[PDB]
Design a binder for this molecule. Structure first.
Ligand SMILES: *[C@@H]1O[C@H](CO)[C@@H](O)[C@H](O)[C@H]1NC(C)=O
Ligand SMILES: *[C@@H]1O[C@H](CO)[C@@H](O)[C@H](O)[C@H]1NC(C)=O
Ligand SMILES: *[C@@H]1O[C@H](CO)[C@@H](O)[C@H](O)[C@H]1NC(C)=O
Ligand SMILES: *[C@@H]1O[C@H](CO)[C@@H](O)[C@H](O)[C@H]1NC(C)=O
Ligand SMILES: [Zn+2]
Ligand SMILES: [Zn+2]
Ligand SMILES: [Zn+2]
Ligand SMILES: [Zn+2]
Lengths: 369, 369
């Protein structure tokens, strides 16, 4: 097919930079992070949407590996598990240096491309990973964190999640609390991409107005095509365009077709909508592979990407528009976030108020007057 | 005084490298780590044993800043707080660049020396910080940890603390558990100094026997001069001699005189003993300033180091013997730890048995039990 052949042509020069893959979660749940276990060899790994040959076959040259710890680890062992999940990614890149190239910069991604290696970055999914600490946040940054999904499927003491918009979770901060604002301010100062996937609409809006740099939705689709609260509504998409942000499309069937069954065409519909409402420089991929149970027909795994690009081409997307959805838009936003960073600027050090910290798993040293 | 003048002469070419200062804990306790607070200004900080003017007058050119979180944080927020405390050390060095030089290697200490700066390293005190995780261990390593105090004054699930020897604690591992042995094995491959302060005699022997590299007692004194179980007995001192380890003397009164009152001459007594039994290369300093409530008359703060050196010259110690206690012995041990590390070797990944993980502040993903 001409279009599939064209997809591959463009992809050899502009590999796909995906914004959210939950393989590290699989490595933990399946092998307790024991990478030397034989069933855990990534060149032969089966039962997952991802593995080395599939990444190569799908022309994936950059991946934000999701460092994820469930919501029930908040106020428990969220910080410890986050560090473990960051460790497995560090190790994965050392065990397979011929494949993965661990990076923490926009320039690093371009280097991986040059070397024919899959750029591997870390994306921390959920604000509960920092346990309301600016110091943990700075520690994660040093450990490689390059994007922080403010929340996951649960409220933090300083940011509300999407379940607030479905009625399941009660609005706590109604967007960002004053400490949440300092978190956002610290993220900008550090040069960490602010990810708005999983947050409530109030938080999306609060952060888009507040953030000094372009934000992202690492794995979110269009609310107009599928009315999921995990999806981005049109008024927000207009904020996305206004700020020159980025929305990285999620392939999960239930966010694509709003039902269990979905296909490659419906995913292209989401990409088309975002492209008209938010503009072409606001579209990207954040498949959510290995994080979701159901993936689209035609988009079974990480090797199916070229087929999705062929469809875009079939639909008359220009080469510039697809290359932008492939890697360029992410690189634009990443560079912006880096240019907006100011490390010589005094870090945020005002802790969250004690009355806002939660759980029965902490001590109160430092707090007094 | 002739001796005081010679001390200052020797100290210019051999600044003291102290193995344990709890200033970080004071910054937490007094200001909640708010370094921008003017009360917290280190050039005029009062009410502590340490500050910039005092560090300069004591001829200190190397400092292992203790990153300590109380035993009651174990199975709670030990990891969070460990990161916060490591964060304060990082910022402190960034905030006072003229004084502090954050280093993580032996050549770094030597450079801090050439540049006239106080080499700042991180020593994590207490195994509860890694929360029985090899992953958290490696995370802490990347964040700056150059020595791990196996335990503080409480047992971890893999090592026994000194309170076992006084009858206050029950010997759980009776040395090092199999997991505890891998922690040691992992510490050897990473190049992290194993600190035996606060551990039980059994743990001291198990580690001295097991470790492929010399160890340290960052802040422990002679048991013979003061029968405190925070002090090292002569049998272990013979082991320190064979393995070429190092004991950095604690200045605390109740460890020096074995009572609330103590003076500079009694500290020199412990140094004399250790130099006799363990050898002149098994001796150093780990004052424990800002960590304990009582310090010797003549050693009220960190500026008093030249006075102790003068007393040693008084007691006929050779220049080389004092140069070694000042900086040379720690440096020898550190480089021996770096040469024994195998970064190329595969990281330890066999987790601690689930049944060995205590507390009700965690989740069991990875095990599923
Ligand atoms: C993974 O398996 C392949 C073939 O089955 C082998 O060539 C490779 O050495 C293995 N890699 C690791 C890290 O075990
Ligand atoms: C495809 O885009 C080109 C842009 O030059 C346009 O001329 C053409 O009409 C488009 N194709 C269709 C079927 O609209
Ligand atoms: C600390 O205070 C002194 C004067 O007391 C001032 O000169 C210096 O700039 C201050 N340093 C910082 C880091 O605030
Ligand atoms: C003092 O130490 C020196 C080494 O410099 C040694 O030769 C001498 O015997 C010692 N003198 C006394 C009185 O112990
Ligand atoms: Zn998600
Ligand atoms: Zn995810
Ligand atoms: Zn201590
Ligand atoms: Zn201490």
């Amino acid at each position: 097919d001409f279009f599939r052949d064209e997809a591959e042509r463009i992809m050899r020069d502009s590999p796909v930079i995906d914004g959210h893959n939950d393989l590290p979660w699989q490595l933990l749940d399946m092998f307790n992070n024991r990478l030397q276990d034989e069933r855990a060899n990534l060149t032969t790994l089966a039962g997952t949407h991802t593995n080395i040959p599939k990444l190569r076959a799908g022309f994936v040259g950059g991946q934000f590996w999701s460092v994820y710890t469930p919501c029930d680890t908040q106020n428990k062992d969220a910080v410890r598990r986050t560090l473990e999940q960051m460790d497995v990614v560090h190790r994965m890149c050392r065990m397979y240096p011929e494949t993965f190239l661990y990076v923490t910069s926009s320039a690093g991604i371009r280097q991986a491309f040059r070397e024919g290696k899959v750029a591997s970055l870390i994306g921390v999914e959920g604000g509960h990973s920092i346990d309301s600490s600016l110091g943990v946040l700075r520690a994660l940054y040093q450990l490689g964190m390059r994007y922080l999904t403010l929340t996951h499927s649960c409220n933090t003491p300083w940011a509300d999640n999407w379940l607030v918009d479905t009625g399941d979770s009660e609005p706590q901060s109604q967007g960002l609390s004053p400490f949440g604002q300092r978190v956002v301010k610290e993220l900008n100062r550090l040069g960490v991409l602010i990810d708005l996937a999983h947050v409530s609409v109030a938080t999306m809006k609060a952060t888009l107005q507040l953030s000094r740099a372009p934000v992202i939705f690492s794995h979110s689709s269009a609310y107009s095509v599928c009315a999921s609260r995990r999806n981005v509504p049109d008024d927000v998409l207009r904020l996305v365009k206004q700020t020159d942000s980025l929305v990285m499309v999620n392939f999960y069937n239930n966010y694509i077709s709003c039902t269990n069954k979905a296909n490659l065409s419906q995913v292209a519909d989401h990409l088309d909508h975002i492209k008209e409402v938010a503009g072409a420089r606001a579209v990207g991929f954040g498949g959510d592979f290995d994080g979701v149970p159901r993936v689209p027909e035609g988009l079974e795994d990480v090797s199916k990407y070229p087929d999705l690009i062929a469809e875009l081409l079939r639909r008359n997307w220009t080469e510039a528009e697809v290359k932008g959805a492939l890697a360029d838009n992410l690189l634009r936003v990443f560079e912006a976030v880096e240019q907006a960073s100011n490390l010589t600027q005094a870090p945020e050090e005002e802790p969250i108020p004690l009355d806002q910290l939660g759980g029965s798993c902490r001590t109160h040293y430092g707090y007094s007057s």
